[PDB]
Structure 1
Amino acid sequence: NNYDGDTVTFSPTGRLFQVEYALEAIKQGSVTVGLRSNTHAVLVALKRNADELSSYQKKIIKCDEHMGLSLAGLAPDARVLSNYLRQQCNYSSLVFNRKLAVERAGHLLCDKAQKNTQSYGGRPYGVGLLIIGYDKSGAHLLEFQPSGNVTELYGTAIGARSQGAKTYLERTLDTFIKIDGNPDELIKAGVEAISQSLRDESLTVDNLSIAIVGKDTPFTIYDGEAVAKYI
């Protein structure tokens, strides 16, 4: 393949192979699930560790009091994108006394990702993101790919073997859609969904991370003993 050298080269069929390789980098990451109802939004993440003596890699990053995300793929790219999102939310608050909408942040991430796939000297990002938030329009969940595509969904999953969780979410859509005012039930639904992507491991207090945002709930992260009641 002579067309995969850089990001400014189309293939004869019209494919960008560096973008596809970044997507492949995503597909080898740990599974994360995002879910929402009319009042709350939830992220569930399975961590990974190098070995037993090592700690587990963090997967959930807080962007603002009403917004956060979980990552799958290359972590430093997630850090870069999260810092950019934090700066944008801070700018919105400082200049307009306004809470940045989730859709606008998705647009900003799409625009920032597009510029890295059209000019020489730069690679596309190597991470996929699930973004949850609560704003004046309610709860929102977004999925971001490094090709620049951003989609708004009721629920989704990314990473290795996420198809089972996605099928579970698609089957039980009408159930978790209407879990309003009961955050624990939504968290348990998300945990059950992420249980569908496990093959040779079980959820423990060391490898499970949860995040929640809602109508009266700021973006909060639970890990360790704080998730012991959801296992």
Structure 2
Amino acid sequence: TTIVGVKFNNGVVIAADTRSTQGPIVADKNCAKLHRISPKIWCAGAGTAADTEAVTQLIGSNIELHSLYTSREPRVVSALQMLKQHLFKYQGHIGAYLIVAGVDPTGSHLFSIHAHGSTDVGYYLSLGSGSLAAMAVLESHWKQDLTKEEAIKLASDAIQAGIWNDLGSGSNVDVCVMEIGKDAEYLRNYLTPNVREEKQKSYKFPRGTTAVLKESIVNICDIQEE
């Protein structure tokens, strides 16, 4: 997994690769790792995948209830504070490692959070097995006062470094852009540098190839009338 977050002029961008693995095996070639805590607060997770999803949904749910209760749009510091207190309580047993990015009435924000419950602030971050490849790129090209276009470019280049150099990362680049005073734009499959080449041969079988003992119609309907 490679995930990055990059602050720019008037907002923040996050990106992720799309390979999910089971050990050394690729289970899903086009996983969507960019999750929504709230409309303008997005995050991406490394570590135990069920924990990152579960913890995202739980805090996303409580954030929505909080927002309804207070009649205010959700803040990134609230997502952060609730995540870290939940994770700290479980002493690292919930293996959630997240980059959290968003905009709110207070401004644009970028945070990382570690499974034991520590958090960090920054202008650019990376996470996952490809985090060192990505950070090499971010440390080479990042500057103060990036434009939106430069930030999307930098973030996706950082993911590409993970895709090509980290075996844990692969396939496509997903991006989400959160500019102040605008809707967040989720760019699914923003880059597509890994189409499977056409195979040499069709493996479609002649019908009747497979040996069969019994056929029956399965009753998927409920109890019939009359």
**What is the aligned partner in structure 1 of residue 160 from structure 2?**
195
Give the TM-score normalised by structure 2: 0.73
Residue 172 of structure 1: which of 136, 141, 148 is its match?
141
Kept in 1: contact 2:16–2:174 (CA 8 A) = yes
**What is the aligned partner in structure 2 of residue 161 from structure 1?**
130
SS state at 2:165 partner? coil
Q: Which has the higher helix share?
A: 1
Give the TM-score normalised by structure 1: 0.72
Amino acid at match of 2:89: K
Kept in 2: contact 1:32–1:157 (CA 8 A) = yes
CA distance in 1, matches of 2:38, 2:188: 19
In the TM superposition, residue 228 of structure 1 has moved relative to its aligned partner by 5.4
Amino acid at match of 2:66: S
Unaligned runs of 5+ in 2: 194-226
SS state at 1:212 partner? strand
CA distance in 1, matches of 2:93, 2:174: 27
- Computed over aligned residues only, the root mean square deviation of the Cα atoms, in angstroms, reads 2.5
Greater radius of gyration (CA): 2
Unaligned runs of 5+ in 1: 1-29, 118-122
Q: Which has the higher strand share?
A: 2
Could you list the per-position Cα deviations for residues 25-62 of structure 1 after superposition, in whole angstroms to 9, with x for gaps in the alignment?
xxxxx111111113121111111156789542221111
Kept in 1: contact 2:42–2:100 (CA 8 A) = yes
Could you list the per-position Cα deviations for residues 58-94 of structure 1 after superposition, in whole angstroms to 9, with x for gaps in the alignment?
2111111110101112111111111122122212221
Kept in 2: contact 1:46–1:208 (CA 8 A) = yes
**Aligned pair count?**
188
Amino acid at match of 1:152: V
Kept in 2: contact 1:64–1:219 (CA 8 A) = no
Instruction: Tell me, yes or no, if structure 1 residue 145 matches structure 2 residue 110.
Output: no
**Sequence identity (%):** 21
